[PDB]
Paper text:
The crystal structure was solved by molecular replacement yielding a single monomer in the asymmetric unit, and revealed an active monomeric HaAEP1 (residues 58–338 with weak electron density for Asn338) that forms a canonical C13 caspase structure, with a central six-stranded β-sheet region confined by five α-helices. The structure of HaAEP1 lacks the C-terminal cap domain and N-terminal His-Tag, displaying dimensions of approximately 44 Å x 42 Å x 39 Å. The 1.8 Å resolution of our HaAEP1 structure allowed us to observe a succinimide moiety (Snn) below the catalytic His in a location identical to human AEP that was hypothesized to play a role in peptide ligation. We distinguished dual conformations of the catalytic His178 and Cys220 residues which we hypothesize represent conformational changes that occur during catalysis and correspond to substrate free and reaction intermediate states. Close examination of the electron density in the active site of HaAEP1 suggested a small peptide chain is intermittently bound to the intermediate conformation of Cys220. Given AEPs specificity for Asx and the nature of the electron density, we built and refined a tetrahedral complex of a three-residue peptide ligand (AAN) bound to the active site Cys of HaAEP1 with partial occupancy. Residues Ala-Ala were modeled upstream of the P1 Asn due to the weak electron density away from the peptide backbone at these residues.
Asparaginyl endopeptidases (AEPs) are a group of asparagine/aspartic acid (Asx) specific proteases that have been classified as belonging to the C13 family of cysteine proteases based on the presence of a His-Gly-spacer-Ala-Cys motif. First described in plants as vacuolar processing enzymes based on their propensity for processing seed proteins stored in vacuoles, AEPs have since been described in a variety of organisms and shown to be involved in a wide range of processes including, cell death antigen processing and hemoglobin degradation. The recent discovery that evolutionarily distinct plant families have repeatedly recruited AEPs to catalyze the formation of ribosomally synthesized and post-translationally modified peptides (RiPPs), through the macrocyclization of linear precursor sequences, has caught the attention of drug designers keen to overcome the current inefficiencies in native chemical ligation that limit the therapeutic use of cyclic peptides. Herein, we describe the first structure of an active plant AEP; one capable of performing peptide macrocyclization. This AEP, the most abundant AEP of five AEPs in the common sunflower (HaAEP1), displays structural similarity to previously published active AEPs from mammals, with subtle differences at residues involved in substrate recognition.
Numbering used by the authors: 58 to 303, 310 to 337
Write the structure that this text describes.
């Protein structure tokens, strides 16, 4: 089977640098794991690398002495094309329903695995998008229920960075869709930036905004430094939960039978981590 990923930054503006830095970094992790560009669909408003406010033009970093994570990232859905309608079409593998953007979609097969990562603002039962309208959790779950009805994936893992992010799935994500999801925070709780001015470890002084989000960099920095053939989703969740409590409470939803699976089945494996 093929590994697919959909990476979504739900916000825009330089003050939200971190959500797009998280998504660019996630792309780098998946590329090191051997996922192909044709199978990684990126949604990012794309106003950060060339931002009038960026002190390192053309570069995005997601930790204080990190490498540039912007170089190489596909521009599938950027600017006004970062929409709920396009995200739905993409997840459902329906290029005819896409309006604007590259036309890349998750035209996946029953044997394929899918990883979804979202980073931005959240509210009760709702996720931000940088264009109107926002993404209502019930509508996202309805897209996932439809994808399941279509039969076009084997298992799916969703990592979700937002305030009140548990509220995206609590009470509404069924446990029998072969979808396991974790979230940065509880249903009525805030989630946090990391690498922020004024709290060590802090970013370089040219940055007046956080470089990343704690739950997001927790899984990414863990993934790029461990052999993912040997680490399970359960071990990753435990490590991410521990790092994020610092904090907020990382929650899990859906098919908990997926937890003992090795992470490389979703994120790939980097030979350098042996």
């Amino acid at each position: 089977g093929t590994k697919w990923a959909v990476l979504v930054a739900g916000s825009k503006g330089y003050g939200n640098y971190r959500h797009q830095a998280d998504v660019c970094h996630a792309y780098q992790v998946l590329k090191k794991g051997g996922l192909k560009d044709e199978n990684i669909v990126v949604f990012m408003y794309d106003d950060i690398a060339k931002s009038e406010m960026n002190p390192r033009p053309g570069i995005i970093i997601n930790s204080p002495k990190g490498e540039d994570v912007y170089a190489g990232v596909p521009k599938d859905y950027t600017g006004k094309n970062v929409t709920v309608d396009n995200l739905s079409a993409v997840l459902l593998g329906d290029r005819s329903a896409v309006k604007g953007g590259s036309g890349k979609v998750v035209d996946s097969k029953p044997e394929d695995r899918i990883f979804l990562f979202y980073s931005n603002h959240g509210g009760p039962g709702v996720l931000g998008m940088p264009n109107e309208p926002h993404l209502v959790a019930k509508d996202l779950v309805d897209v996932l229920k439809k994808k399941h009805a279509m039969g076009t994936y084997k298992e799916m893992v969703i990592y979700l960075e937002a305030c009140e992010s548990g509220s995206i799935f609590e009470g509404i994500l069924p446990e029998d869709l072969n979808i396991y999801a974790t979230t940065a925070s509880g249903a009525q709780e805030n989630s946090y930036g990391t690498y922020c001015p004024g709290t060590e470890p802090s970013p370089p002084p040219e940055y007046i905004t956080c470089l990343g989000d704690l739950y997001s960099v927790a899984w990414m920095e863990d993934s790029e430094t461990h052999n993912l053939k040997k680490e399970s989703l359960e071990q990753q969740f435990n490590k991410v939960k521990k790092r994020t409590s610092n904090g907020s409470h990382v929650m899990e939803y859906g098919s908990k039978d997926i937890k003992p699976e090795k992470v490389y089945l979703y994120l790939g494996f980097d030979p350098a981590t042996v």
